[PDB]
Coordinates of C-alpha atoms and ligand atoms in Angstrom, one line a residue:
Chain A
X1 CA 90.5 69.7 77.6
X2 CA 91.6 72.8 79.3
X3 CA 95.4 73.3 78.8
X4 CA 97.5 74.8 81.6
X5 CA 98.6 78.4 80.8
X6 CA 102.4 77.8 80.6
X7 CA 102.7 80.3 77.8
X8 CA 101.8 83.2 80.1
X9 CA 104.7 82.2 82.4
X10 CA 107.5 81.2 80.1
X11 CA 106.7 83.7 77.3
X12 CA 105.9 86.7 79.6
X13 CA 107.1 90.0 78.1
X14 CA 108.4 91.1 81.5
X15 CA 109.8 89.0 84.4
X16 CA 109.9 90.1 88.0
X17 CA 112.9 90.9 90.1
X18 CA 114.2 88.0 92.2
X19 CA 113.5 89.8 95.5
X20 CA 109.9 90.3 94.3
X21 CA 109.6 86.9 92.5
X22 CA 106.2 86.4 90.9
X23 CA 104.1 83.4 91.7
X24 CA 101.4 81.9 89.4
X25 CA 99.0 79.0 90.3
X26 CA 98.2 76.3 87.8
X27 CA 94.9 74.6 88.6
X28 CA 92.1 72.7 86.8
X29 CA 94.0 72.2 83.6
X30 CA 96.0 69.7 81.5
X31 CA 99.8 70.3 81.5
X32 CA 101.7 68.2 79.0
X33 CA 105.0 68.9 80.7
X34 CA 107.0 66.8 78.1
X35 CA 106.8 69.6 75.5
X36 CA 108.9 71.7 78.0
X37 CA 112.0 69.5 78.3
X38 CA 111.6 67.8 74.9
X39 CA 112.2 71.3 73.4
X40 CA 115.9 71.6 74.2
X41 CA 115.6 75.4 74.2
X42 CA 116.6 75.8 77.9
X43 CA 120.1 75.7 79.4
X44 CA 119.0 74.4 82.8
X45 CA 116.2 71.9 83.3
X46 CA 116.5 69.9 86.6
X47 CA 113.7 68.1 88.4
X48 CA 114.0 67.0 92.0
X49 CA 112.0 64.2 93.7
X50 CA 110.0 63.7 90.5
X51 CA 111.6 62.7 87.2
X52 CA 111.4 65.1 84.3
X53 CA 110.5 62.2 81.9
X54 CA 107.2 60.4 82.5
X55 CA 106.4 63.4 84.6
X56 CA 103.1 64.1 82.8
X57 CA 101.7 60.7 84.1
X58 CA 101.1 62.1 87.6
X59 CA 98.3 64.1 89.2
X60 CA 98.8 67.0 91.6
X61 CA 96.4 69.3 93.3
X62 CA 98.1 72.6 92.5
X63 CA 101.3 73.7 90.6
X64 CA 103.2 76.9 91.5
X65 CA 105.1 78.7 88.7
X66 CA 107.6 81.0 90.3
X67 CA 109.5 83.3 87.8
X68 CA 112.3 85.8 88.2
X69 CA 115.6 87.0 86.7
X70 CA 119.0 86.4 88.1
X71 CA 122.4 86.4 86.5
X72 CA 124.2 83.3 85.1
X73 CA 126.5 82.6 88.1
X74 CA 123.5 82.5 90.5
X75 CA 121.4 79.9 88.7
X76 CA 123.1 77.1 90.7
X77 CA 121.7 78.7 93.9
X78 CA 118.1 77.8 92.7
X79 CA 118.3 74.3 94.2
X80 CA 117.7 72.6 97.5
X81 CA 120.4 73.1 100.1
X82 CA 122.2 76.0 98.4
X83 CA 123.6 79.1 99.9
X84 CA 124.4 82.6 98.5
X85 CA 122.9 86.1 98.1
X86 CA 120.0 84.8 96.1
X87 CA 119.3 81.7 98.1
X88 CA 119.7 83.4 101.5
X89 CA 118.0 86.8 100.9
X90 CA 116.0 86.5 97.7
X91 CA 114.5 83.1 96.8
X92 CA 114.9 80.0 99.0
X93 CA 114.0 76.4 98.1
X94 CA 113.2 73.7 100.7
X95 CA 115.6 70.9 101.3
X96 CA 112.8 68.5 100.4
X97 CA 112.1 70.2 97.1
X98 CA 110.1 68.0 94.7
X99 CA 109.8 69.9 91.4
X100 CA 111.7 71.3 88.5
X101 CA 113.9 74.4 88.1
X102 CA 114.1 75.8 84.6
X103 CA 116.4 78.5 83.3
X104 CA 117.5 80.0 80.0
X105 CA 119.8 82.9 78.9
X106 CA 117.9 86.1 78.3
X107 CA 120.7 88.5 77.3
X108 CA 118.8 89.4 74.1
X109 CA 115.8 90.6 76.1
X110 CA 116.9 91.8 79.6
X111 CA 120.2 93.5 78.7
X112 CA 120.5 97.0 77.4
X113 CA 123.3 99.2 76.1
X114 CA 124.5 101.3 79.0
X115 CA 122.9 98.9 81.5
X116 CA 119.4 97.7 82.3
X117 CA 118.8 98.6 85.9
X118 CA 115.2 97.5 86.3
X119 CA 116.2 94.1 87.7
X120 CA 117.0 94.2 91.4
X121 CA 118.2 91.8 94.1
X122 CA 118.3 92.1 97.9
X123 CA 121.9 92.6 99.0
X124 CA 121.5 93.3 102.8
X125 CA 119.3 91.2 105.2
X126 CA 119.7 90.2 108.8
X127 CA 118.7 86.6 108.4
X128 CA 118.2 84.0 105.7
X129 CA 114.8 83.7 104.1
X130 CA 112.5 80.8 105.0
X131 CA 111.7 78.5 102.0
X132 CA 109.2 80.2 99.6
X133 CA 109.5 83.5 101.5
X134 CA 108.9 86.8 99.7
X135 CA 110.6 89.9 101.2
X136 CA 109.7 93.0 99.4
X137 CA 110.6 95.3 102.3
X138 CA 112.7 98.3 101.2
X139 CA 113.5 99.6 104.7
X140 CA 117.0 101.1 105.1
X141 CA 119.4 98.4 106.4
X142 CA 121.1 99.4 109.6
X143 CA 124.7 98.0 109.6
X144 CA 126.0 100.3 112.4
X145 CA 125.3 101.6 115.9
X146 CA 123.6 104.8 114.8
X147 CA 120.0 104.7 113.8
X148 CA 119.3 105.3 110.1
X149 CA 115.9 107.1 110.5
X150 CA 114.9 106.0 107.0
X151 CA 117.8 107.7 105.2
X152 CA 120.7 105.8 103.4
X153 CA 124.1 107.0 104.5
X154 CA 127.1 105.9 106.5
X155 CA 126.5 102.3 107.8
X156 CA 123.0 102.7 106.4
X157 CA 122.4 100.9 103.1
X158 CA 119.4 100.6 100.8
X159 CA 118.7 96.8 100.9
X160 CA 118.2 96.4 97.1
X161 CA 121.0 96.4 94.5
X162 CA 120.6 96.7 90.7
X163 CA 122.1 94.1 88.4
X164 CA 122.8 96.6 85.6
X165 CA 122.8 93.9 82.8
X166 CA 124.8 94.9 79.8
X167 CA 124.9 92.9 76.5
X168 CA 128.7 92.7 76.6
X169 CA 128.8 91.1 80.1
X170 CA 130.4 87.8 80.9
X171 CA 128.1 84.7 80.7
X172 CA 128.0 84.4 84.5
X173 CA 127.2 88.1 84.7
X174 CA 124.5 87.8 82.0
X175 CA 120.8 87.7 82.8
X176 CA 118.9 84.4 83.0
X177 CA 115.1 83.9 83.2
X178 CA 114.2 81.2 85.7
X179 CA 110.9 79.3 86.2
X180 CA 110.5 77.1 89.3
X181 CA 107.6 74.6 89.2
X182 CA 106.4 73.4 92.6
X183 CA 104.2 70.3 92.6
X184 CA 101.9 70.5 95.6
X185 CA 99.6 67.5 96.3
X186 CA 96.9 68.8 98.6
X187 CA 94.0 66.6 99.8
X188 CA 91.6 67.9 97.3
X189 CA 91.1 65.6 94.2
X190 CA 94.1 66.4 92.0
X191 CA 93.2 69.1 89.6
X192 CA 96.4 69.2 87.4
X193 CA 97.0 65.8 85.9
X194 CA 98.1 66.7 82.4
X195 CA 98.0 63.5 80.3
Chain B
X1 CA 102.3 128.4 106.7
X2 CA 105.3 128.9 104.5
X3 CA 108.3 128.1 106.6
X4 CA 110.7 131.0 105.8
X5 CA 114.4 130.2 106.1
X6 CA 116.5 133.3 106.4
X7 CA 120.3 132.8 105.9
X8 CA 123.1 134.9 107.4
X9 CA 125.1 136.7 106.3
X10 CA 124.2 137.9 102.8
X11 CA 127.8 137.8 101.7
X12 CA 131.1 136.5 103.2
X13 CA 134.6 137.4 102.1
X14 CA 137.4 135.2 103.6
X15 CA 140.9 134.2 102.7
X16 CA 141.7 130.5 101.9
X17 CA 142.4 128.5 105.0
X18 CA 140.1 130.5 107.2
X19 CA 137.2 129.2 109.3
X20 CA 133.7 130.0 108.0
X21 CA 130.3 129.9 109.7
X22 CA 126.9 130.4 108.0
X23 CA 123.5 130.9 109.6
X24 CA 120.0 129.7 108.7
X25 CA 117.1 130.7 110.9
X26 CA 113.6 129.1 110.4
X27 CA 110.4 130.9 111.1
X28 CA 109.1 128.0 113.1
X29 CA 110.5 124.7 114.5
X30 CA 111.8 122.3 111.8
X31 CA 113.3 120.1 114.5
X32 CA 116.1 118.5 112.5
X33 CA 114.8 118.4 108.9
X34 CA 117.4 120.8 107.4
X35 CA 120.2 120.3 104.9
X36 CA 122.9 122.4 103.2
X37 CA 123.7 122.6 99.5
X38 CA 126.5 124.1 97.6
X39 CA 126.2 125.7 94.1
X40 CA 128.9 127.0 91.8
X41 CA 127.9 129.3 88.9
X42 CA 126.6 127.5 85.8
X43 CA 126.0 124.3 87.7
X44 CA 123.3 122.4 89.5
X45 CA 123.5 122.3 93.3
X46 CA 125.4 119.7 95.3
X47 CA 124.2 118.1 98.6
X48 CA 126.7 118.6 101.4
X49 CA 125.0 118.3 104.8
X50 CA 121.6 116.7 105.6
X51 CA 119.5 116.3 108.7
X52 CA 121.5 119.3 110.1
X53 CA 124.6 117.2 111.0
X54 CA 125.1 114.3 108.5
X55 CA 127.5 114.7 105.6
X56 CA 126.6 113.6 102.1
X57 CA 128.7 111.1 100.1
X58 CA 132.1 112.4 99.2
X59 CA 131.9 115.5 101.4
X60 CA 135.3 116.3 103.1
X61 CA 135.5 116.4 106.9
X62 CA 136.1 120.2 107.1
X63 CA 132.4 120.7 106.4
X64 CA 130.1 120.3 109.4
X65 CA 126.7 121.4 110.7
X66 CA 124.8 121.5 113.9
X67 CA 121.6 123.1 115.3
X68 CA 118.0 122.2 115.9
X69 CA 114.6 123.8 116.2
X70 CA 114.8 127.2 114.5
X71 CA 118.6 128.0 114.3
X72 CA 121.3 126.1 112.4
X73 CA 125.0 126.6 111.6
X74 CA 127.2 125.4 108.8
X75 CA 130.9 125.4 109.5
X76 CA 133.9 125.1 107.2
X77 CA 136.9 124.7 109.4
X78 CA 139.5 125.7 106.8
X79 CA 138.4 127.1 103.4
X80 CA 139.9 125.4 100.4
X81 CA 139.8 127.2 97.1
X82 CA 137.0 125.0 95.8
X83 CA 134.8 125.7 98.9
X84 CA 134.0 129.2 97.7
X85 CA 130.5 129.2 96.3
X86 CA 126.9 129.9 97.2
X87 CA 125.3 127.8 100.0
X88 CA 121.5 127.2 100.5
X89 CA 119.6 125.6 103.4
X90 CA 116.5 123.5 102.8
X91 CA 113.9 122.0 105.1
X92 CA 111.7 118.9 104.8
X93 CA 109.4 119.4 107.8
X94 CA 106.6 121.0 105.7
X95 CA 105.6 120.9 102.1
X96 CA 106.9 123.1 100.5
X97 CA 110.7 122.2 100.7
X98 CA 111.5 126.0 101.1
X99 CA 115.1 127.2 100.7
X100 CA 117.1 130.0 102.1
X101 CA 117.9 132.8 99.7
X102 CA 121.6 132.0 99.7
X103 CA 124.9 132.9 101.4
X104 CA 127.7 133.7 98.9
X105 CA 131.3 133.1 99.9
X106 CA 133.8 135.1 97.9
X107 CA 137.6 135.1 98.1
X108 CA 139.1 137.9 100.2
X109 CA 142.0 139.6 98.4
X110 CA 144.3 142.5 98.2
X111 CA 143.1 145.8 96.6
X112 CA 143.5 146.2 92.8
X113 CA 142.4 149.1 90.6
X114 CA 140.9 148.1 87.3
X115 CA 142.1 148.7 83.8
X116 CA 139.7 151.0 82.0
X117 CA 138.8 150.9 78.3
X118 CA 136.2 152.8 76.3
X119 CA 134.9 151.5 73.0
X120 CA 133.2 153.7 70.3
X121 CA 130.3 152.3 68.4
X122 CA 131.2 150.3 65.3
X123 CA 130.5 151.7 61.8
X124 CA 128.4 148.6 61.0
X125 CA 126.1 149.3 63.9
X126 CA 125.7 152.9 62.8
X127 CA 124.3 151.6 59.5
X128 CA 121.5 150.6 61.8
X129 CA 119.5 153.1 63.8
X130 CA 121.3 152.5 67.0
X131 CA 124.6 153.3 68.7
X132 CA 126.2 151.4 71.6
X133 CA 129.1 152.7 73.7
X134 CA 130.9 150.2 75.9
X135 CA 133.1 150.9 78.9
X136 CA 135.2 148.1 80.3
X137 CA 136.3 147.8 83.9
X138 CA 138.9 144.9 83.9
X139 CA 140.2 142.9 86.8
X140 CA 139.5 144.8 90.0
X141 CA 139.1 143.1 93.4
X142 CA 136.5 145.2 95.3
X143 CA 133.3 144.3 93.5
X144 CA 132.0 147.8 94.5
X145 CA 132.8 150.1 91.7
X146 CA 131.0 153.2 90.4
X147 CA 130.7 154.0 86.7
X148 CA 129.3 157.3 85.3
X149 CA 129.0 158.1 81.6
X150 CA 129.5 161.6 80.3
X151 CA 128.3 163.1 77.0
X152 CA 129.7 166.6 76.5
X153 CA 130.5 166.4 80.2
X154 CA 126.9 166.1 81.2
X155 CA 126.3 162.7 82.8
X156 CA 123.1 160.7 82.1
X157 CA 121.1 158.1 84.0
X158 CA 119.0 155.3 82.5
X159 CA 120.7 154.7 79.2
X160 CA 123.6 152.8 80.8
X161 CA 123.3 149.2 81.9
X162 CA 125.9 147.2 83.8
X163 CA 127.0 143.6 84.0
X164 CA 129.5 142.0 86.4
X165 CA 131.4 138.7 86.0
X166 CA 131.8 136.1 88.8
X167 CA 135.0 136.2 90.8
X168 CA 137.6 135.0 88.3
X169 CA 139.0 131.7 89.4
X170 CA 142.6 132.8 88.8
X171 CA 143.3 136.3 90.1
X172 CA 140.1 136.5 92.2
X173 CA 139.0 139.7 90.5
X174 CA 135.8 141.0 89.0
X175 CA 135.3 142.6 85.6
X176 CA 132.4 145.0 84.8
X177 CA 131.0 146.3 81.5
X178 CA 128.7 149.3 81.2
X179 CA 126.9 149.8 77.9
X180 CA 125.6 153.3 76.9
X181 CA 123.2 152.7 74.1
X182 CA 122.0 155.7 72.0
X183 CA 120.2 156.3 68.8
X184 CA 122.3 157.2 65.8
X185 CA 120.6 160.6 65.6
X186 CA 121.4 161.5 69.2
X187 CA 124.9 160.0 68.9
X188 CA 125.7 162.4 66.1
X189 CA 124.5 165.3 68.1
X190 CA 127.3 165.3 70.6
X191 CA 131.1 165.4 70.5
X192 CA 133.1 163.8 73.3
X193 CA 132.2 160.5 75.1
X194 CA 133.8 159.7 78.4
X195 CA 133.6 157.1 81.1
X196 CA 134.4 158.1 84.7
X197 CA 135.3 155.2 87.0
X198 CA 135.5 155.4 90.9
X199 CA 137.0 152.6 92.9
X200 CA 138.8 151.9 96.2
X201 CA 142.0 151.2 94.3
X202 CA 141.8 154.6 92.6
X203 CA 143.0 157.6 94.5
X204 CA 141.2 159.7 91.8
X205 CA 138.3 158.7 89.6
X206 CA 139.9 157.7 86.3
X207 CA 138.2 158.7 83.0
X208 CA 138.9 157.3 79.5
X209 CA 137.7 159.4 76.6
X210 CA 137.4 159.3 72.8
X211 CA 136.1 161.8 70.2
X212 CA 133.4 161.0 67.7
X213 CA 135.4 161.5 64.6
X214 CA 138.5 159.5 65.8
Chain C
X1 CA 127.3 106.1 85.0
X2 CA 124.3 107.7 86.7
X3 CA 122.7 110.1 84.3
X4 CA 119.8 112.7 84.4
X5 CA 118.9 114.4 81.1
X6 CA 116.2 117.0 81.1
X7 CA 114.8 118.1 77.8
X8 CA 111.7 119.7 76.2
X9 CA 112.3 123.2 77.4
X10 CA 112.5 126.3 75.3
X11 CA 110.3 129.4 74.5
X12 CA 106.6 129.6 75.2
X13 CA 104.2 132.4 74.7
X14 CA 102.7 133.6 78.0
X15 CA 99.6 131.6 78.8
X16 CA 100.8 128.5 76.7
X17 CA 102.1 125.2 78.0
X18 CA 105.0 122.8 78.0
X19 CA 106.0 119.3 79.0
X20 CA 109.4 118.5 80.4
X21 CA 111.0 115.0 80.4
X22 CA 113.8 113.4 82.4
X23 CA 115.8 110.5 81.2
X24 CA 117.3 108.5 84.0
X25 CA 119.9 105.8 83.6
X26 CA 122.6 104.2 85.8
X27 CA 120.4 103.5 88.8
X28 CA 117.2 101.8 90.0
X29 CA 114.9 104.8 89.1
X30 CA 111.9 102.9 90.3
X31 CA 113.1 102.9 93.9
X32 CA 113.8 106.6 94.1
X33 CA 111.7 109.6 95.0
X34 CA 111.8 112.3 92.3
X35 CA 111.5 116.1 92.3
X36 CA 111.6 119.2 90.2
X37 CA 113.5 122.3 91.2
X38 CA 113.5 125.6 89.4
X39 CA 116.0 128.4 89.6
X40 CA 115.2 131.8 88.0
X41 CA 118.3 133.5 86.4
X42 CA 120.4 135.1 89.1
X43 CA 118.1 134.0 91.9
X44 CA 117.6 131.2 94.5
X45 CA 116.4 127.7 94.4
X46 CA 112.6 126.9 94.5
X47 CA 111.2 123.4 94.8
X48 CA 108.5 122.8 92.2
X49 CA 106.9 119.3 92.7
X50 CA 107.5 115.9 94.4
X51 CA 106.6 112.4 93.3
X52 CA 106.9 109.1 95.3
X53 CA 108.4 106.0 93.7
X54 CA 104.9 104.5 93.9
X55 CA 103.5 107.8 92.6
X56 CA 100.4 108.5 94.7
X57 CA 102.0 110.9 97.2
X58 CA 102.1 114.1 95.1
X59 CA 102.9 117.6 96.2
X60 CA 103.5 121.0 94.5
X61 CA 104.6 124.5 95.3
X62 CA 101.6 126.5 96.3
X63 CA 102.1 128.9 93.4
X64 CA 101.9 126.2 90.7
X65 CA 99.0 124.1 92.0
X66 CA 96.4 123.4 89.4
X67 CA 98.8 124.4 86.6
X68 CA 101.6 121.9 86.9
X69 CA 101.4 118.1 87.2
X70 CA 104.1 115.5 87.7
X71 CA 104.4 111.9 86.4
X72 CA 106.9 109.1 86.3
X73 CA 107.4 105.9 84.4
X74 CA 109.2 103.2 86.4
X75 CA 109.4 100.9 83.3
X76 CA 110.9 103.4 80.8
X77 CA 112.8 105.3 83.6
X78 CA 111.4 108.8 82.8
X79 CA 110.1 111.7 84.8
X80 CA 107.7 114.3 83.3
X81 CA 106.4 117.7 84.3
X82 CA 103.4 119.1 82.5
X83 CA 103.2 122.9 82.7
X84 CA 100.0 124.7 81.8
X85 CA 98.9 128.4 81.9
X86 CA 102.6 129.4 82.0
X87 CA 103.5 132.9 83.2
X88 CA 106.7 135.0 82.8
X89 CA 107.2 134.2 86.5
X90 CA 108.0 130.6 85.5
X91 CA 111.1 131.6 83.5
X92 CA 113.8 129.4 85.1
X93 CA 116.1 126.5 84.7
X94 CA 114.2 123.4 85.7
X95 CA 116.4 120.7 87.3
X96 CA 115.4 117.0 87.6
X97 CA 116.3 116.1 91.2
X98 CA 117.0 112.6 92.6
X99 CA 116.3 112.2 96.3
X100 CA 118.1 110.1 98.9
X101 CA 115.9 107.0 99.5
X102 CA 113.0 108.0 101.7
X103 CA 114.1 111.4 102.8
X104 CA 111.7 112.7 100.1
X105 CA 113.7 115.9 99.7
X106 CA 117.5 115.5 100.1
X107 CA 118.5 115.5 96.4
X108 CA 121.4 113.2 95.6
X109 CA 121.9 113.8 92.0
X110 CA 120.8 116.6 89.7
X111 CA 120.4 116.9 86.0
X112 CA 122.2 119.6 84.1
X113 CA 118.9 121.4 83.8
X114 CA 116.9 122.8 80.9
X115 CA 116.0 126.5 80.5
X116 CA 112.3 127.3 80.3
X117 CA 111.6 130.9 79.1
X118 CA 108.0 132.2 79.0
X119 CA 107.7 135.5 77.1
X120 CA 105.8 137.0 74.2
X121 CA 108.9 138.1 72.3
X122 CA 109.8 136.2 69.1
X123 CA 113.0 134.3 68.5
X124 CA 115.7 136.6 67.1
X125 CA 119.3 136.1 66.2
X126 CA 122.1 138.3 67.6
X127 CA 123.8 141.1 65.8
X128 CA 127.6 140.9 66.3
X129 CA 129.7 144.1 66.4
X130 CA 133.4 144.4 67.2
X131 CA 135.0 146.4 69.9
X132 CA 138.2 147.6 68.3
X133 CA 141.3 148.2 70.5
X134 CA 142.2 151.7 71.4
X135 CA 144.2 153.5 68.8
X136 CA 147.8 154.0 70.1
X137 CA 147.1 151.8 73.1
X138 CA 150.5 151.2 74.8
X139 CA 153.9 149.6 74.0
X140 CA 154.0 146.4 76.1
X141 CA 151.4 146.3 78.9
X142 CA 148.0 145.2 77.6
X143 CA 145.3 146.1 75.1
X144 CA 141.6 145.2 75.3
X145 CA 139.2 144.2 72.6
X146 CA 136.1 142.1 72.0
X147 CA 132.7 141.7 70.3
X148 CA 129.3 143.0 71.4
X149 CA 126.5 140.5 71.1
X150 CA 123.2 142.5 70.9
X151 CA 119.5 141.9 70.2
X152 CA 118.9 138.2 70.5
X153 CA 115.9 137.0 72.4
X154 CA 116.5 133.3 73.5
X155 CA 118.9 133.7 76.3
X156 CA 121.7 131.1 75.7
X157 CA 124.5 132.3 73.5
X158 CA 127.9 130.7 73.1
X159 CA 130.8 133.1 72.6
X160 CA 134.3 131.7 72.1
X161 CA 137.5 133.2 70.7
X162 CA 139.6 131.7 67.8
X163 CA 137.7 128.4 68.0
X164 CA 138.6 127.7 71.6
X165 CA 142.3 128.5 71.1
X166 CA 142.0 132.0 72.8
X167 CA 140.9 131.4 76.4
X168 CA 143.2 133.4 78.7
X169 CA 142.0 137.0 79.4
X170 CA 138.5 136.3 78.0
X171 CA 135.5 137.8 79.8
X172 CA 132.2 136.8 78.4
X173 CA 129.8 139.0 80.5
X174 CA 126.3 137.9 81.7
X175 CA 123.6 139.3 79.4
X176 CA 121.2 142.1 80.3
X177 CA 117.6 142.2 79.2
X178 CA 116.8 145.6 77.6
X179 CA 113.6 147.6 77.6
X180 CA 112.8 146.0 74.2
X181 CA 112.8 142.6 75.7
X182 CA 116.0 141.6 73.8
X183 CA 119.3 140.4 75.4
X184 CA 122.6 142.2 75.0
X185 CA 126.1 140.9 75.8
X186 CA 129.8 141.7 75.5
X187 CA 132.8 139.4 75.3
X188 CA 136.2 141.0 75.8
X189 CA 139.8 139.7 75.8
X190 CA 143.0 141.3 77.0
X191 CA 146.1 140.7 74.7
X192 CA 149.7 142.0 74.5
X193 CA 150.0 145.7 73.6
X194 CA 152.2 145.2 70.6
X195 CA 150.6 142.1 69.1
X196 CA 147.7 143.6 67.2
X197 CA 149.0 143.9 63.7
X198 CA 150.8 140.5 63.9
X199 CA 148.1 138.4 65.5
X200 CA 144.5 138.1 64.4
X201 CA 141.6 137.7 66.9
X202 CA 138.1 136.5 65.7
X203 CA 134.8 135.8 67.6
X204 CA 132.7 132.6 67.4
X205 CA 129.2 133.7 68.3
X206 CA 126.6 130.8 68.5
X207 CA 122.9 131.0 69.2
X208 CA 121.4 127.5 69.2
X209 CA 117.7 128.6 69.2
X210 CA 118.3 130.2 65.8
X211 CA 120.8 128.0 64.0
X212 CA 123.2 131.0 64.0
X213 CA 127.0 131.0 63.7
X214 CA 128.4 134.5 63.3
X215 CA 132.2 134.9 63.2
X216 CA 133.6 138.4 63.3
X217 CA 137.2 139.7 62.8
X218 CA 138.2 142.3 65.3
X219 CA 141.2 144.5 64.3
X220 CA 142.1 148.2 64.7
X221 CA 140.8 150.9 62.4
Ligands
NAG301 C1 106.6 80.3 73.8 O1 106.5 80.6 72.4 C2 107.1 79.7 71.6 C3 107.0 80.3 70.2 O2 105.7 80.9 69.9 C4 106.4 78.3 71.7 O3 107.1 77.4 70.9 C5 106.5 77.9 73.2 O4 105.8 76.7 73.3 C6 105.9 78.9 74.1 N1 106.0 78.5 75.5 C7 105.1 77.9 76.1 C8 105.3 77.5 77.6 O5 104.0 77.6 75.6

């Protein structure tokens, strides 16, 4: 009767930046997923491939819990077949995504008077990320003919940009904490059933 | 080894709209790791040029820099009034990021003799055991001025102490104050206190005088 | 708005210690290299210490090794400098410097700086004496007058005239450190020759390290 540690993910004091999105593995435990949606405390709870209800009657080998913070008008990008700065350069989901995307407003926790600049997103990148790719490189982005030589300047940009969340921002500009559950069914006898 | 950056010249006096060139020589090769800063009095420095040719954000085009190895030049094509300040050069090829000792760019101007005022000690200060006599040199261009105190027409040295303002933003002049501090006992031992002032704008050293008992 | 607020300065007895703190806001402080730069009064710039955004690459000026140590908090966005075994040589304004990403030494943005003064002298307020205008000055040209601010140890003083209403012609001179170890300073203003009995001029001398506010009327004798 080992219960899956969802409290560590959803109730974490600090969430990671989207460019450095954190990944947690759920294995060898019981996950009663129904308490998650049958709580009505989130603003987005979509499941793809699998169905959110009667979802805890299935067995998987491993469950991945990806967590990060984006603003309100980028939550729609956390979905299969989406485009945008977050989907292209920060966090990409496969077209064949089977799993659940969970988000809720976190203006009370991640916004500060004068701006909370701890949360970052990747603004410049040559090519789109592959699905489930983490790019933490902070190399100066060359957008011109002259070499940057590691110094930001004309046509040489630092790849990461700060959200600067403020409590008086618009809802689309407000911070949202996102948890992505990936259901991976490897060959090993399924270790996360969760009656 | 401490990479010594020696700047040139020590001071530079030019009129607005003139071209300005500043030197910074390194003891050993820094390659291209050198930048230029600008600092106005009572303020933190401001990055202008970096990597010996690249301009910082918001730096106007009239500023430029070149050079490599051990010799570097900063160029202001046409001096605006707000470009008159102190400029430092800094290297990042060896810890520690040593600086030059500064090149100060002052406004060239026409000659102006100062207005001279002498101030006797206050009665309130003489209720203390000290007496301070203050000579004021006001609004003169050439910063080079000579001030000699005279007590019964016998000048001293050591008891005066000078202080010079920055070039006033408006008339581009300098103001100097020399302070002759004496004990009350020695102050009430002599009779006439005078301040002789020599300057380029003065065709004769001007003295201002007062007598102890008004 | 990008901000850099240094604090924690002040007086220290020679051989004591301090800790300075830098409050960053308006930018991703965790992605920047940080530095400390001193400037002694009337002298040039000297680089003090360097810290990487990760924090392990640490360098100091050779003259302050073993005595100074630098630290940074990427969560609370704060830079610190611990100073130990302080000498009178360390008397300077210590700026908190913000370096262009991964140049390690081209300082984008500077704080206003805080003044660290290391000396055995004790805090003392300033005596304020007037500098009365010359008796029988002139008819219409100019007359000069001011206050003399003498014998205050902590260096910053604020001298204004008529509560900031008298600004033209004012010359607040730089201070000079006397043989005693105490600072002395004059502030003078030039005013119309025949306006002395009609108009009143008054100093506003302020010394923050002593909670002192001395106003002084300055009129002829
Ligand atoms: C987070 O905490 C709340 C209140 O303590 C609790 O109701 C909720 O179940 C927790 N989240 C998870 C995933 O357990």
